[PDB]
C-alpha cells in the first residue's frame, strides 16, 4: 500500500541519497584506500600520480 | 523462380552476410586456416 | 492509455511468459538427468 | 547509329576502368593498414625470439 | 533429499558454462575490435598504491571526436568488496560496487548520476557448479503504486560437458499507465578442444551467431554474424531485413598485441598495442577505414602505470585475493 | 668598363643571400611545422630507378579529412632538365619543368591543369655571385588586346657579408576593363655566426618577422611573428588589427627527427619522424591540439622507398649531378 | 543581503576553480603531447649513442 | 596588333596545347625514364613499386 | 592616458603577439636558451 | 568599369612604381660601394 503523505517523503529521501553518493562517493573510496592500503602513502602522492 | 527473389534489394544484406559467415567458418575450420599462423 | 480490462489481459500474459520462462528453466536444470538416461 | 555504339563502349570502359581503379586503391591501402603495423610488430617478435635463443646459446 | 540429486550430478563431468552476458566473450571481447576502437588522442595515467587491499587511482584525458575531455577514476578492492567510480568532466559520476556473499555469489551494483540520465542497476549473480543464474533490476521502483522498472533474469545450463543452453527472460513496465512488456531470448554455446560456437535467438527475431578458433597459443580468429528484422519499414506491410558479419584475428607477441577485423559492409579496422621495453608505458594505435566511402578514423593512446608496491611483498596476496570484479 | 666593377666587388667578402622566397627558410621551412602538418592516414610508396639521370616514381594514398585519396607522381631529372608531374585522383595534373641555362640561371615553370582552376607560372631565376633576381609571370596573356596577368619581380642584394636587403615588386591586371594594380614589399635578412633574423614589410602593411638560432648541431629553435591590418571591418571607418606568433624547435637524432611548436592562439603542435632501422620505411606522427577549444587533429604517415639502384654504381655521378630543382 | 554576498563568493570560487581545472588539464596534455613522443625518440638516441661508444670500447 | 581572326585561332591553339600536356605529359616522363635510365628496368616494375 | 587604449579589443591580439615574440627572442638569445639542449 | 582618363592615370602610377622599384633596385646594387667608402 502507498499514500500521498508517504510517497512525498520517500521520494525526497532517495533524492537526498542520490545527491549524497553523487558527491561523497569517491571521497569515501579515497578514504578507504589511503587509510588501509598496505603502505600508507604520503598524502601528497595520493592525487598526484606519476609525480 | 525464387532465385530471382533471392537477390531482392531488401534481402541483399542478409544473404550477403550469411555467405560471408559461411565462408569464414569453413576457412577457419579447414586446413586453410593454418595460413593465418606465422612463425 | 489503456482500458482496465486490457491492462489485466496484458498482465495476464506477462506473468504467463515469465511463468513459461521458469518452467523452461527447471526443464534445463533437470535436462542432464534425462540425457544420461538416454 | 555510330554514336550510340561509340557511347556504350566509352561508358563501359569508363565504368570498369573506374571500378578497377577503386578496387586497386582499396587493396593497396588495406594492405598498408594491416601490412605496416603487423610487420612492425612481427619484426620485433622475431628479434626478441632470436635474442633469447641467442642468450640460451651463450649460457650453454 | 536434495543431497541425492547432488550425488547424481557429480557423476557427470559438467562444469560451469559461464554467464549469458559472456556467452560470446571469446569472439566479441577478446578478438574483435568493437569494444576497443576509438578516435582522436587519448591518455590514461594510473598509479597503484597496493594490491591487498587493491587500491588504484587513474586519470583519463581525451580529445578529438572523443569529446569527453577528462575523467578521474578511483578503485578499491578486496576479498569481500570492490568499489570503483569515475567522475567525468561535466561532473557525471559513474560508479560500481560489488559485494561478495560467498565463494560463488556476488551482488553487483552500478549507478550513473548526473549528466544525461540518472540510472541505477542491481544484479545478484550466482555461478553454480554447473549453471549460472542472474536476476537484474534497472531503475527499480514501487513508488508508482506498483512494481515498475526493468527486470532481467538470466540462466545458463550445462547439459553435456561441451554444450550449454540457457535463456534470458525480461519483464518491464514504464509506469502503471500501460501494460507490461515481456520477452524471452534463447542462447546456446558449444565448446570443443580448439573452437567455440554460440548462438543467441533474441526477442526481436534478431539472431546473433559467433565462432572462435584458437589456431595456436599466440594466434586466434573468430567471426560473428548478426541478422535483424524490423516492422514494415516499407509503410505497406511486410518486414525489412538486414545483417552484418565481421571477421577478426588477434596476434599475441612477446611485447605487443595486434588485432584486425573486416565487416561485411567493407569496413576494415586495425588495432596495435605495443609495450615500450621495461617501462610501463603502452602505446595503442587504432585505425579504421571504410572502403565504401574511403573515409578513415584514426586514434592513438598512451597508457602509463606508476606504482609504489614492492611486487613480491604483496604479489603473494594478490594471487590469492579474489576481488569480486 | 663592366670589368672595373667586378674587380672592385671581389675586394669585399659578399656572398649570395639566397632568394626572397627563401629569406626565412630556416624558421618557416626547417623548424616550424606549418608546412608538414596533416590529418588522417597517409602513405607514400616510392621507387627509384636511377640517379644519373635521376628517375623516380611514387604513389601517394591519403584518407580522413585529407580527402584527396590518391596521387601518382613521376620525376625525371638530370644536369640540364628536371621534369615532374602529379596526377591526383580527380584527374587534375600538377607539373613542373625547370631548364638550366647555365651554372647560375634556370627557368622554372609550373602548370596546373584540370581541377578547380587552370594555372601557368613561369619564372627566370638568376642566382648571381652577390645577389638574387627573379622575374615571375602567372597566367600571362596578351590575347586580351594588351598585357594581362600577374607579374612579380624579386631582388635580394648583399650589402655587407652579414646583412642582405631586397624588395619584391608586383604588377597585375585582371583584364583591360580596369586599371593595373601594383605593390612593393621590402625585405631584410641578417645572419650572424649562430642566428638569423629577417623581416618582410608586405604590400598590405602586414609585417612578418622571424628569428632562428642553432643551439647545437642537433638542436634548432626559431620564432616568427605576423602582423596585419585590414580596412574598416567596423563598418564605421578605422582599421582592424591582428597578429600571431609561433615558437618552435627541431631536434635531430641519429634515427629520428622531432619538431614542436606553439602559437600565440594557444595551438600546440608536434611532429615526430622515425626511421625503422635498416629498412627504408619512415613513420611520421603528427598531432595538433588547440587549447582554447580542446579539439585535436591527428595524423599518421608511412613513407616507403624501394630502389633498384646500386648506390655506389651511380652515386659517384649523383654527388656532382646538379639537378635544377 | 546575505544571499547576495553568498552568490558572489560561490561564483568566484566556481570561476577560479573552473579556471584552475582548465589550466591543469591544458598543462597535463601539453606535457603528454611533447613528453611522450620526445622521450620515445630521445630514449632511442641515447641507446644508439651508448651502443656505438660500447662498440668502440670492444674494438679498442 | 591583334585581330578577331587571329584571336580565335591562337585561342584554340592554347586550348589544344593545354589538353596535349594534360594527357601526354606523364607518359613523356615515363618514356624518358624508361629509355635512358642507367639500367633499363623490366617494364613490369615501372608502375609496380614495392613488388 | 594611452595605457587604457593599449588593451583595447582590437589591439589585444597585436600587443599580445608582440610580447610573446619579444620574450622568445630574448629567451633563445640568452644563456637560458641552453635549457632546450639535452645531451 | 572605369573612364578612359582614369585608366591612363592608373597606368601612369603603375609604371611609376615599377620605375621606382628598378631605381631602388639599382641603388642596392650600387650600395656596397658606398659602404666601403664609409
Ligand atoms: C592527450 C595526450 C595524448 C598523447 C598521445 C601520445 C602518442 C604518442 C605516439 C608515438 C608514436 C611513435 O612514435 O611510435 C611509433 C611506433 C613504433 O615506435 P617504437 O616503439 O619506438 O619502434 C620500435 C622501437 N625499438 C626499436 C626500440 C624497439 O609505431 C607504431 O605505434 C605503429 C605505427 C603504425 C603506422 C601505420 C600507418 C598506416 C598507413 C595507412 C595508409 C592508408
Ligand atoms: C581486404 C579487402 C578485400 C576485399 C576488398 O578490398 C580489401 O576489395 C575491394 C573491392 C571494393 C569495391 C570495388 C568497387 C566499388 C565500386 C564503387 O561502389 C560504390 C559506388 C560509389 C560511386 O561510384 C560510391 O561512392 C565504390 C565502392 C566499391 C563497391 C568497392 C567497395 C570496397 C571493396 C569491396 C573492397 C574490399 C574491402
Ligand atoms: C587481398 C587483401 C589485401 C590485404 C591483404 O590481404 C587481403 O594483403 C596481404 C598482404 C600481407 C603482407 C604480405 C607480406 C608481409 C611481409 C612480412 O614480413 C616478414 C617477412 C619474413 C621475415 O622473416 C617472414 O615472413 C610480414 C607480413 C606481411 C606484412 C603481410 C601482412 C598481411 C598482409 C598485409 C595481407 C592483407 C590482409
Ligand atoms: C601489399 C603491401 C606490399 C608492401 C608491404 O606490405 C603490404 O610489404 C611489407 C614489407 C614491410 C617491411 C618489412 C620489414 C620491416 C623491418 C622492421 O625493422 C625493424 C626491426 C629491426 C629489428 O632488428 C630490423 O629492421 C620494421 C618494419 C619493416 C620496415 C616493414 C614495414 C612495412 C612493409 C614495408 C610492408 C609493406 C606495406
Ligand atoms: C572473400 C572475401 C571476404 C568477403 C569480402 O571480401 C572478400 O567480399 C567483398 C564483397 C564486398 C561488398 C560488395 C558490394 C558492395 C556494394 C556496395 O554498394 C552498395 C550500394 C551503396 C551503399 O549502400 C553504394 O553505392 C557497398 C559495399 C559492398 C556491400 C561490399 C562490402 C565489402 C564486401 C562484403 C567484401 C568482403 C570483405
Ligand atoms: C610565456 C609562455 C609563452 C606564451 C604563452 O604561454 C606561456 O602565454 C600564454 C597566454 C595565452 C593566451 C591567454 C589568453 C587567451 C584568451 C583566450 O580567450 C580569447 C577570447 C575568446 C576566444 O577568442 C574566449 O573567451 C584565448 C586564448 C588566449 C589568447 C591564450 C592563448 C595561448 C597563450 C598565448 C599562451 C602562450 C602559449
Ligand atoms: C605549454 C602551455 C603553457 C601555457 C598554457 O598551457 C600549455 O597554459 C594554459 C592556460 C590555458 C587557459 C586557462 C583557462 C582558460 C579559460 C577558458 O577561456 C575560454 C572560455 C571558454 C568557455 O568558458 C571557451 O570554451 C578556456 C580557455 C582558457 C583561456 C585557457 C586557454 C589555453 C591556456 C592559455 C593554456 C596555455 C596553452
Ligand atoms: C609547463 C608547460 C607544460 C608542458 C611542458 O613545459 C611547458 O612541460 C615540460 C615537461 C617536459 C618533460 C619532462 C620530462 C621529460 C623526461 C626526459 O627523459 C630523459 C630523462 C634523462 C635520461 O637520462 C635525461 O634528461 C625527456 C624529456 C621530458 C619528456 C620532457 C619533455 C618536455 C616537457 C614535456 C615540457 C613541456 C614543454
Ligand atoms: C609531465 C609528464 C610527466 C610524466 C612523463 O612526461 C610528462 O615523464 C616521461 C617519462 C617517459 C618515459 C621515459 C623513458 C622511456 C623509456 C623508453 O624505452 C625504450 C628505450 C629502451 C632502450 O633500451 C629503454 O626503455 C620508452 C619511452 C619511455 C617509457 C618514456 C615514455 C613517456 C614517459 C612516461 C613520459 C611521461 C608522459
Author numbering:
A (entry chain I), H (entry chain J): 3 to 53
B (entry chain G), I (entry chain H): 22 to 60
C (entry chain E), J (entry chain F): 9 to 46
D (entry chain C), G (entry chain D): 63 to 122
E (entry chain A), F (entry chain B): 25 to 349
Please quote the authors directly:
We then plunge-froze the mixture and performed single-particle analysis of the complex in GDN, which resulted in a 3.3 Å resolution map of the TOM core complex to which we applied C2 symmetry during the final reconstruction step. Our high-resolution TOM core map indicates two copies of the Tom40 barrel, the helical Tom22, Tom5, Tom6, and Tom7 subunits, but it lacks the receptors Tom20 and Tom70 and the presequence. Our map contains clear densities for the 19 individual β-strands of the Tom40 barrel and the loops connecting them. The longest loop, joining strands 14 and 15, is visible at a lower density threshold, indicating that it is flexible. At the end of β-strand 19, α3 extends into the IMS and folds back into the pore to interact with β-strand 4. Due to flexibility, α3 is only visible at a lower density threshold, while its C-terminal residues are well ordered. At the point of contact between the monomers, we see interactions between β-strands 19, 1, and 2 of the two Tom40 barrels. In the space between the protomers, we identified a phospholipid that interacts with Tom40 and Tom22. The lipid is in contact with strands 17, 18, and 19 of both Tom40s and appears to interact hydrophobically with the F309 sidechain, for which we see two rotamer conformations. We assigned these densities that each span half of the membrane to GDN detergent molecules used for solubilization.
pmcThe translocase of the outer membrane (TOM) complex is an essential component of the outer membrane of mitochondria that acts as the main gate for protein import. The TOM core complex of Neurospora crassa (NcTOM) in the mitochondrial outer membrane is a dimer with 5 subunits per protomer: Tom40, Tom22, and the small Toms (sT) Tom5, Tom6, and Tom7 (7). The protein translocation pores are formed by two copies of Tom40, each a 19-strand β-barrel with helical termini. Between the pores, two copies of the α-helical Tom22 span the membrane, with its disordered N and C-terminal domains facing the cytosol and IMS.
